[PDB]
Symmetry: D2
């Protein structure tokens, strides 16, 4: 029972679902935010009855500010924000439309901005020695064919992590980033080249599990990581050189 | 006389002006693109009479495609694109409006996208073993207080460099990035803390010169750098650890 | 009943690692170089701790100890290569002897310990852990530390090479790089205030137990998909 | 009349650096270790070239040579620390002697040459250049190269430390890290096709002259604001 409040965007499926389950297990009050799938959210809240869930498009800043203000009033503060929501719109760069660029930009970048602005304003005004953990990707670090738009936003996320870490370090807020490689989710379940990935590209020869990303995020949110800030930790079975 | 064609966006002032002058000296036909200052462009073209100049907002994809198609018809191809145009809209993150985010995103990211898409389509279709050089910033690499939006776009630029390098490597197109630290321009001429920067933060104890960035960009565009691709080279007097 | 070996495990960061792994249920063996009194005082606090005086740059004495440890406990699950020395000074005033002394411990000590332990981990099919301690000095360079920063960059490189070489065996190999940590290695500094005020965004030195917490995480089964990485714990001081 | 010293300057990448700096108007001194025939054949091609046989791990012989060079030409403007060896093999089969041999040349050779040259550059107020050759093996790790990758990571770290230490003197110190370059060091590989097909996006090895072009740029007055950096020339093979 940590007596702490955490927001996990994209917190009902995939990596976000595992992060939610891990912080819940550690005794956080968790608020999980999602975009469309009411069924997954309700099913997750039936499994974890103390969880709050909200359908909220994080690219809509006015709805984000309203939701963060609501959460702040019910639980007296915000101790941890995990910016995990994200989308992909793959395609070769020469066939990738403006719309695929702006859709991914508006969620992976502007959604992190909306949540982080609203939450950090509260942490600063109340002098909460809080935590922000962003989820990026090896794609943003090393590049990935067919992912110019995704990789761009994930590189932006790492840079925002470092800038904000410097801006809020004097307020005792740490701001870090976690960059997974290939994780067994649905975002990677439609791949057919999984065997070539494991056999040739990943030294540990397997995909990561959602729970393994959650364990790292939970370490960074805990009081055992207060001297770590501005860092990008890569969880990828050894796949890339950071 | 290189008998090559180069486009330099933001090519009439500051770093872009120096890049223009250096490629012109090396015998490129240079097309310099700018945003508003007709006087600077005309004055630069009076100094370099073989230079082409165009007032073109690179965030406007239809005007970009029209201009790139024009340049392609007049000079039979494009050998080198330098994506140098960029803006800053500084402010502390908690007071930085959506508009400051989207203005910087639309030029530093979407402007690079529009130019690179139009130019790379031509290089691929004609099998030109061409060059793209993007201009980023130490701000994107290490973060900078008051520059969440700028730093985000400059990190995105580095990630796009790596993705596109991988996508076009088989076509013999190299795609690299140059990240200056503090360069003596007008973008840094309004600073009052310049002495503290030089005395304490920069080991070489001076700002860089525009021509020094241009010399690096010109090396990367030359035939002496065809085995370098996907890299980010930092020119900063030693200021940061990459 | 997992077995951990912590070199330099009786003072400073190593002591805190020993204490943390002890608290987490490991059988811990702490190796030290010369200070018998500190070692015995720690064994007083932690009665189940084994302590051995061993110069890790002596390959034969290292092999003897690792083989004895392995015979006694039936395996080795975790090696923390923490022992390290500094011999600082301007490059132009830094003798060959200051280079070789720091190389022989910070590089060859890691090599000797890791050769002995990994051979056993691989022979016994142990999905073990090696965690090496480097430094931000090796990542970003540091005036007056050409020799120290050389070996700490070497340690990071060795971590990455060994992670690739032993991945198929399920042995992860990671590195922790601290910034300024409050220990004896840093008690003599005169510029502590200026480092805190100007160089460290969090405006304080780290504590040894904060390094131990990160080491303990990497050693646990909650970190099995992290390998070959160097994680910096430095209050924001450097860009990795 | 600038003076450049290129260690290992008679074969492979070093030969191409010697040739490039010669073409650029330097007085070049090429240092080599044992192959007199190759050295004389290069001096035949480049009549103004000085060549010396010198084991750079011997500090006294290095000091003798640098002091002679300096007396003859009145200064030293550029040192390229290019000499290097590999003694590859699995970590568990890599003797102490393979570690020390590679350390003594790849680390201590750089140290001995750089101590001698930087002392003179600083004494004479020369705004000189040191360029060190590392490797992607040191950046990202490489199976079978624990010792080589150790020293190449050390070289990168030393570059950064020396860049900070000598910046106030106007001496820039940079590192070039090649990927796979067509030389004798790589002629014996059997997996060349698979490396080209799968690991190198540009699908070819680099040429020695492409490394020399980058070295020559860093040595020129067009690179005076670049210091402490490691520039990778590798066809896209790794992420830095
Ligand atoms: N999976 C992998 O292999 C890798 C993942 N990552 C990162 O991991 C994170 C999570 O990935 P993963 O678990 O696979 O993703 P999933 O696609 O499985 O889940 C995405 C979640 O984001 C929510 N979401 C999407 N758009 C919005 C929006 N506009 N506003 C609010 N919520 C939104 C979804 O809501 P809903 O359920 O209603 O649709 C869902 O809960 C991402 O940020 C991704 O970039 C990074 C590298 C690799
Ligand atoms: N200067 C420095 O210290 C640093 C610079 N950089 C990078 O260097 C690059 C150049 O910097 P610097 O020379 O100082 O910049 P300047 O502000 O001096 O020049 C910017 C140029 O960009 C053009 N431009 C701006 N917006 C657009 C647009 N929408 N479409 C087309 N052209 C446009 C301007 O046109 P016009 O002249 O008509 O206004 C001008 O020519 C930037 O990308 C910047 O991020 C990176 C790190 C530090
Ligand atoms: N403290 C800091 O700020 C930073 C530390 N580090 C790294 O952290 C590690 C620990 O540093 P710190 O705790 O400050 O060091 P201390 O000097 O406080 O402790 C060093 C320990 O290493 C042991 N040791 C030294 N040489 C040998 C040897 N040849 N064989 C066996 N044991 C040996 C010592 O034995 P004995 O007790 O008998 O002397 C002692 O237990 C080092 O690797 C260091 O480089 C990295 C960055 C910053
Ligand atoms: N080739 C590649 O693919 C890569 C190379 N590198 C680096 O590039 C550099 C050159 O490599 P490469 O050209 O392939 O090497 P070569 O083996 O082809 O050439 C080595 C040169 O170093 C000289 N040398 C060796 N030991 C000594 C010594 N103790 N004292 C003086 N000179 C010595 C040799 O002298 P002699 O001629 O008498 O034998 C020779 O001139 C090295 O630092 C290497 O690590 C890095 C990454 C990849």
């Amino acid at each position: 029972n940590a007596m702490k409040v955490a927001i996990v965007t994209g917190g009902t499926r995939g990596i976000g679902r595992a992060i939610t389950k891990e912080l819940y297990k550690e005794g956080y009050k968790v608020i999980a935010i999602y975009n469309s799938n009411d069924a997954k959210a309700r099913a997750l809240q039936e499994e974890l009855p103390k969880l709050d869930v909200y359908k909220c498009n994080i690219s809509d800043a006015k709805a984000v500010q309203k939701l963060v203000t609501k959460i702040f009033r019910e639980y007296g503060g915000i101790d941890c924000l995990v910016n995990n929501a994200g989308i992909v719109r793959d395609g070769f760069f020469l066939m990738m439309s403006k719309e695929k660029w702006m859709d991914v930009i508006n969620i992976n970048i502007m959604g992190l901005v909306n949540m982080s602005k609203a939450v950090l304003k509260i942490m600063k005004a109340k002098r909460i020695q809080g935590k922000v953990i962003n989820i990026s990707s090896t794609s943003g670090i090393a590049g990935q064919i067919g992912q110019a738009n995704y990789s761009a936003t994930k590189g932006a996320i790492i840079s925002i992590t470092k800038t904000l870490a410097k801006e809020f370090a004097s307020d005792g807020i740490t701001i870090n980033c976690v960059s997974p490689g290939f994780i067994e989710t649905d975002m990677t379940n439609e791949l057919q080249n999984k065997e070539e990935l494991k056999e040739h590209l990943i030294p540990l020869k397997r995909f990561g599990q959602p729970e393994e990303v959650a364990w790292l995020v939970s370490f960074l949110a805990s009081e055992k990581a207060n001297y770590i800030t501005g860092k990008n930790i890569v969880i990828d079975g050894g796949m890339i050189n950071d």
